[PDB]
Design a protein around this ligand. Structure first.
Ligand SMILES: Cc1ncc(COP(=O)(O)O)c(/C=N/C(CO)(CO)CO)c1O
Ligand SMILES: Cc1ncc(COP(=O)(O)O)c(/C=N/C(CO)(CO)CO)c1O
Lengths: 394, 394
């Protein structure tokens, strides 16, 4: 019955308003591969709004690997990993990720989002504590919520705040600190040396979410612990397959005894169907390519350094990024919607960040690089961004 | 740091014990397609532990559709649906599911589990209430937990308990009832006529989880509302693609204004990468086949009726199922582990249900039918199950 439910959604008018103003640019239907150019409504659009950092969703070897897995294993496993849903190729990918991130063992999840729900929901319990960076990814907040522990946020990369909040807690309790490695909104990196130094003093477990770090930072792209040399001070390395690795799914890696607890206790792996064979095979082949072919990570960083230099040279106001995510400040929700739509209609795809996710005065567009971007494409997009910023008067 | 984390997992000894006794049969690595026979450790094993009710993960048209989508769209969308992750084929599948279940609109999620997290986390809020059947799927409990509402369980299919608990609640609050359509453990069907009659009296929203109903009950397999004629008394129809539809992902369907709220407010769609092209194309082609080819659902039910008759004729003690899920009672955790392992080693795959998921005295094995099963295969499995039940002394 719909009376009260109608009242619950009645106040949500922003989508109605965007559409009526001709500004709506969410759920843009793409008709082509995710690439440096995408087809929308039969037109070509430069893509600077992707998380495919290495451009690998179009790699013919990864496509063929997925196509070959479909031929061999079919379209799905039709069950959870713990029952009828495990393949030899799931185990092969867990061994290969374990090796890549320098951990004993790993467990796959069918999404990155579910990869965070697993360890955050089931390791800390009643009388325990989870400490979260206040800018942690939504999946980390939600995972923590599914625990029976007390969830405490600390100031973004604020090590004094972390230390103070940990010092307040009963000695006779377990604590786990979970942080994004690279934070997607502003593209900044966790202070993992100070965080792990505090974790060690309070015997708190450390989990890092490397969704935006894998294939971006660390040796051969192995992530944030690898970037800092701190493998031995990080208990759990969580990753996704939906960004550099050009697929769908994720993993948590760590000590064999912890991973064995997780694979048997995490509801998001016990009660959700396993990764499709095609996604396992595309993840396996992408992981081989990132290691074997250092070109991809090098070119991603050539493009990032070029684009960032060009944007600062044109007088754009950039967020404190340390990654291929280049946040461009606009500081008006209405201009941010207008700029996004004008760029879309001129053939540039960027992602807006607006209220209520951020305060109006910190509203921005995110311009993300891929390894397969050319300097010609970056130049065309920045030229159009200068024109649209001028028309929008920012 | 690992001191307190080591203590948290220290008491979890059942996996150690199963493995040392030679009884461990979780995460069995399959080397072949999910089919009526699977290859494990180079051997052939009859599969009666799957959720692929229509046998469609091996259908060459669905494999080719997925392979063709990989060729056209590549291995992944590399973003959330609301940003850079929407394809024309996602929208096509939402229109086609909307039509199938007789609703205005639908929104896809990259897993079934995330399909429940979406509406349960974001429609009811502070001062609102969610009413859950106590046997609801884990993803429904977890979704409800992510809400800011008061979550209340009612007795399994206990309409007096539902009615009493709803009658206790402030009039000036929104309420949503969420139920599995077919409950997977025992295979029983919700009393949707009485539940919707109560919902209508209290103006409570109704959401049904049809994970195990789609492709099983209702007209052309359209689910539980369709089974009862009650489309107009169900606000939200949730489904998965990981069972009959032979893929990965899920959806919520309902009124265009509700679905528009969801697609813009549910964290499990805003903050998780979209379904891979291969999974969209395999879901689209499976949905065409289930409707166009009534054979599949007919044969699933021929097999279910045959197997259930044969099991009752052999004196097995069956759960109160109304579905292709045939729960066989064992009523000892140790015998349930032993029976499962002995059957595995004799070439029969069944799923055990043990403590702490159920009380020891209700421990059982779940024997699930697929349309592609033969009577010869069902006979071989039941023959082996009689022998193993005799050896195990149950
Ligand atoms: C009622 C219901 N609702 C939602 C889900 C979650 O769907 P999925 O994530 O596609 O596995 C399941 C998953 N079910 C299992 C097999 O039964 C694990 O419980 C995994 O697919 C379910 O049974
Ligand atoms: C730090 C972090 N952690 C976990 C996730 C969830 O991973 P996935 O489910 O694969 O999208 C994301 C997803 N990120 C987006 C694009 O940034 C949406 O937030 C979707 O892939 C993430 O950024």
């Amino acid at each position: 019955s719909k009376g009260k439910l109608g009242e619950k959604i009645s106040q949500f008018k922003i989508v109605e308003e965007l559409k009526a103003k001709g500004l709506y640019a969410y759920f843009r239907p793409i008709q082509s591969k995710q690439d440096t150019e995408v087809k929308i409504d039969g037109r070509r659009v430069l893509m600077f709004g992707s998380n495919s950092y290495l451009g690998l969703t179009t790699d013919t070897r990864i496509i063929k690997a997925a196509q070959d897995a479909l031929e061999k294993y079919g379209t799905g496993c039709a069950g959870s990993r713990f029952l009828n849903g495990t393949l030899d190729i799931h185990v092969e990918l867990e061994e290969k990720l374990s090796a890549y991130v320098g951990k004993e063992a790993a467990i796959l999840f069918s999404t990155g989002f579910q990869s965070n729900l697993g360890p955050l929901s089931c390791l800390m319990g009643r009388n325990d504590y989870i400490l979260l960076d206040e800018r942690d990814h939504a999946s980390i907040i939600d995972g923590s919520r599914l625990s029976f522990s007390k969830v405490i946020k600390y100031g973004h990369n604020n090590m004094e705040d972390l230390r103070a909040k940990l010092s307040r807690l009963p000695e006779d309790s377990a604590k786990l600190i979970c942080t994004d490695g690279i934070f997607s909104m502003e593209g900044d990196i966790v202070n993992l040396p100070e965080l792990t130094s505090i974790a060690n003093e309070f015997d708190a477990a450390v989990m890092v979410d490397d969704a935006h770090s894998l294939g971006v930072i660390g040796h051969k792209g192995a992530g944030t612990a690898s970037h800092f040399g701190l493998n031995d001070d990080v208990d759990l390395i969580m990753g996704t397959f939906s960004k550099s690795l050009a697929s769908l799914g994720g993993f948590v890696a760590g000590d064999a005894d912890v991973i064995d607890f997780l694979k048997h206790n995490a509801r998001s792996v016990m009660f959700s169907a396993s990764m499709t064979p095609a996604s396992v095979a595309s993840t396996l082949k992408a992981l081989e390519i990132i290691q074997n072919e250092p070109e991809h990570i090098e070119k991603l960083w050539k493009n990032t350094d070029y684009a960032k230099a060009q944007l600062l040279d044109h007088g754009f106001d950039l967020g404190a990024t340390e990654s291929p995510i280049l946040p461009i400040f606009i500081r008006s929700n209405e201009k941010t919607f207008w700029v996004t739509k004008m760029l879309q209609d001129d053939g540039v795809f960027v992602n807006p960040v607006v209220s209520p996710a951020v305060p109006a005065e910190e509203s921005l567009i995110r311009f993300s690089l891929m390894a397969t971007h050319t300097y010609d494409q970056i130049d065309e997009a920045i030229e159009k961004m200068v024109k649209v910023f001028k028309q929008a008067e920012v």
